[PDB]
Amino acid sequence: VMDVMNRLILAMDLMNRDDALRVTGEVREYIDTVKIGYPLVLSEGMDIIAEFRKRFGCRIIADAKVADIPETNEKICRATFKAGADAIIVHGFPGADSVRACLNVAEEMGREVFLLTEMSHPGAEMFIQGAADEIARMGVDLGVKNYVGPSTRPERLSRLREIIGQDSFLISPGVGAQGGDPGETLRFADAIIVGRSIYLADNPAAAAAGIIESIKDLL
Amino acid sequence: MDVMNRLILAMDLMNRDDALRVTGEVREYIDTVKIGYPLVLSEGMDIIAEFRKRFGCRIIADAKVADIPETNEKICRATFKAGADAIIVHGFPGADSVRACLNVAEEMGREVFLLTEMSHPGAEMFIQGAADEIARMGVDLGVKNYVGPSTRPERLSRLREIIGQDSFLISPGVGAQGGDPGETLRFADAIIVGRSIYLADNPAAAAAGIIESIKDLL
Numbered sequence: 001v002m003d004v005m006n007r008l009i010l011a012m013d014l015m016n017r018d019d020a021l022r023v024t025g026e027v028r029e030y031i032d033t034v035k036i037g038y039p040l041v042l043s044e045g046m047d048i049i050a051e052f053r054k055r056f057g058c059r060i061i062a063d064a065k066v067a068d069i070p071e072t073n074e075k076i077c078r079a080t081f082k083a084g085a086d087a088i089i090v091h092g093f094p095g096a097d098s099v100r101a102c103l104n105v106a107e108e109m110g111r112e113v114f115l116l117t118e119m120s121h122p123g124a125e126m127f128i129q130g131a132a133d134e135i136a137r138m139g140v141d142l143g144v145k146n147y148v149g150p151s152t153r154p155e156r157l158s159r160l161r162e163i164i165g166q167d168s169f170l171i172s173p174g175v176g177a178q179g180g181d182p183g184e185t186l187r188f189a190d191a192i193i194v195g196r197s198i199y200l201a202d203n204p205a206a207a208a209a210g211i212i213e214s215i216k217d218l219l
Numbered sequence: 220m221d222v223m224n225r226l227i228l229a230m231d232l233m234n235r236d237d238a239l240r241v242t243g244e245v246r247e248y249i250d251t252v253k254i255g256y257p258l259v260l261s262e263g264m265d266i267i268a269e270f271r272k273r274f275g276c277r278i279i280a281d282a283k284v285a286d287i288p289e290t291n292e293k294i295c296r297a298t299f300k301a302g303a304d305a306i307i308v309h310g311f312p313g314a315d316s317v318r319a320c321l322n323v324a325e326e327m328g329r330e331v332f333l334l335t336e337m338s339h340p341g342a343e344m345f346i347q348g349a350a351d352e353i354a355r356m357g358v359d360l361g362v363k364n365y366v367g368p369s370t371r372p373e374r375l376s377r378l379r380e381i382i383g384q385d386s387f388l389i390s391p392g393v394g395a396q397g398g399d400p401g402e403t404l405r406f407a408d409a410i411i412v413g414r415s416i417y418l419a420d421n422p423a424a425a426a427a428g429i430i431e432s433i434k435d436l437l
């Protein structure tokens with residue numbers, strides 16, 4: 001599994017190049033793994049992934065939440081990996097063929113899929129939550145090794161960890177701004193995803209350092 | 220929304236030259252183009268402005284928006300800034316995520332299309348069982364535009380029943396995936412067509428053929 005520095009992944013959702021690069025540069029001593037999603041990619045182009053690799057030599061997880069038919073999923077993954085992403089995040093709710101399409105591209109291109117099971121926001125309770133255990137089980141059956149689950153629901157995160165096993169890799173967003181606790185989340189997740197509580201801070205480096213200090217005994 | 224010939228081109232070619240050429244070849248037949256991530260992630264969001272400059276077509280951005288409310292807001296803002304007239308949003312992630320997109324759309328004078336049931340076989344696993352409720356959710360939220368599957372006309376018909384005849388319904392899965400243009404237009408206002416046109420030996424003849432086959436419905 002990827003070796004995430006300090007068990008902390010930056011969710012870089014700032015939407016202009018200059019700010020995104022500044023903030024990522026400021027926290028680079030603490031974090032070697034950056035999640036780049038559509039807020040930044042749609043604002044600045046897929047070439048932003050190349051710029052981050054060039055400037056920081058950080059791993060990049062492309063947060064695409066791939067959620068299309070298999071044929072379109074294949075195209076999305078191919079374009080994303082071509083750009084230099086180490087891994088891509090894929091929704092499980094559109095079903096097994098859609099996931100398998102992404103896995104097939106990732107295998108061909110020598111990259112990784114992360115399967116998003118249950119989401120962290122309140123709306124996730126309407127439809128996703130009731131499907132999530134089965135989505136995880138589907139991931140296990142398809143041979144998925146990397147997963148995403150919600151910090152905001154420790155009981156659900158615990159269950160997802162059970163389903164996927166200790167050997168699978170699990171990352172968890174919802175820490176900080178959405179109310180999840182770093183240490184508690186790391187009881188089950190290999191790494192925590194943190195966006196706003198770092199990138200909106202007066203001093204992002206201090207904010208990251210503070211989160212790390214708070215989980216020091218878990219590193 | 221007034222879609223020419225009830226036909227929306229899904230332009231999923233992944234290089235600028237081919238995408239522009241093929242769209243140009245069928246431009247006389249359409250005034251609405253769906254542009255998605257295969258093209259946008261390969262060529263940049265600036266491609267949307269280029270389509271508007273070249274073709275003066277309506278643009279539906281196929282983002283399958285499926286994030287938390289805060290991120291959904293950002294995705295919609297970026298997408299509408301690029302000149303999209305409308306955006307496709309998943310209903311599965313729940314009401315707050317949809318409302319986030321509705322808020323931005325209202326602010327920028329654009330439209331949200333709510334994707335209810337999808338057209339591929341995998342949709343049967345989780346989406347299909349939620350789809351009626353997702354549609355009702357759309358109605359509750361005041362959503363006027365919907366997307367449902369050409370590949371399952373009985374499910375498409377049910378979706379039409381739920382949203383009413385006043386709502387606008389577009390439908391992919393026509394051609395390559397097995398859906399029939401005419402049958403689909405019994406229930407949808409417009410059909411979405413990608414490969415059957417853009418992979419055809421002659422895209423223009425392909426579009427012309429499709430339109431001929433639904434001539435009585437226009």
Ligand SMILES: O=c1cc(O)n([C@@H]2O[C@H](COP(=O)(O)O)[C@@H](O)[C@H]2O)c(=O)[nH]1
Pocket residue numbers: 011013037063118119120121148149150173174175176177178193194195196197286287290
């Ligand atoms: O269930 C999920 C899955 C996500 O990818 N995310 C993503 O993780 C990040 C959370 O950022 P923040 O720490 O600012 O709440 C955002 O990029 C969001 O899109 C999430 O919040 N919940």
Ligand SMILES: O=c1cc(O)n([C@@H]2O[C@H](COP(=O)(O)O)[C@@H](O)[C@H]2O)c(=O)[nH]1
Pocket residue numbers: 068069072229231255281307334336337338339366367368391392393394395396411412413414415
């Ligand atoms: O349920 C759905 C929803 C979609 O947006 N789509 C999209 O509609 C288009 C279908 O293209 P095609 O005619 O080549 O099958 C693709 O862009 C696909 O991503 C779909 O096929 N099924």
